[PDB]
Amino acid sequence: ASVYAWNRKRISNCVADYSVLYNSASFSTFKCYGVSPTKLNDLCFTNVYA
Amino acid sequence: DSFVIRGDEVRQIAPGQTGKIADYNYKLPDDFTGCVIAWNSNNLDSKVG
Amino acid sequence: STASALGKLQNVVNQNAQALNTLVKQLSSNFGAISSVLNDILSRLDPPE
């Protein structure tokens, strides 16, 4: 969708691997602020938003 | 230390940085001191074929 | 019969207890960081910050 109508999805009750997202080079900008990208595999969250 | 890199991956050359070649091919210490220089060589280091 | 005749010793004890209590309570302040517990900071992000 357009930027003024940004599409929001809620993700929960899953097992997520972020290494398959980090290693892939298809992304020009992969910028993470509050956490280190390599530590995502060791943290458990709830109510993820995309 | 000299080598040849893709144009886009140039920002992987920094201390405290991780990447494909930054973890499997070349590593920079976090407390590195010195300078980094890079310049395009498309007219020379590239082949039409 | 009458109590509250030994106020000075009680004052000393109470002052010491209050000092220790405020010292132990001061351990729950951020001071401008992201968390007040060190283990979470260690386990959530890499050294450079």
CA distance C26 to B36: 45
Helix (H, G, I), strand (E, B) or coil at A8: coil
Q: Which amino acid is at A23?
A: N
**What does the block give as tokens for A9?**
């999805």
Maximum Cα–Cα distance across chain B:
41
> How buried is A35 (Cβ within 10 angstroms: 0-12 exposed, 13-18 middle, 19+ buried)?
middle
Q: Do C45 and A35 touch (CB under 8 A)?
A: yes
Helix (H) or strand (E) holding C11: helix C7-25
In chain B, where does DSSP find H-type helix? Answer: 20-24, 42-45
Closest CA to B8 of A19, A25, A21: A25
Question: Distance (Å, rounded) from C-alpha C21 to C-alpha A41?
Answer: 39
Contacts 24+ apart (CB under 8 A), B14-23: B16/C46, B16/C47, B16/C48, B18/A37, B18/A38, B20/A23, B20/A25
**Dist CA A1 CA A8 (whole Å):** 10
Using only the alpha carbons of chain A, give its radius of gyration: 13
Q: Do B18 and A25 lie within an 8 Å CB cutoff?
A: no
Cβ distance B30 to C48 less than 8 Å, yes or no, reads yes
A10 forms bridges with which residues in the sheet? Answer: A49
> B17 to chain C: nearest residue by CA?
C48
What is the rounded end-to-end Cα distance, in angstroms, of chain C? 63
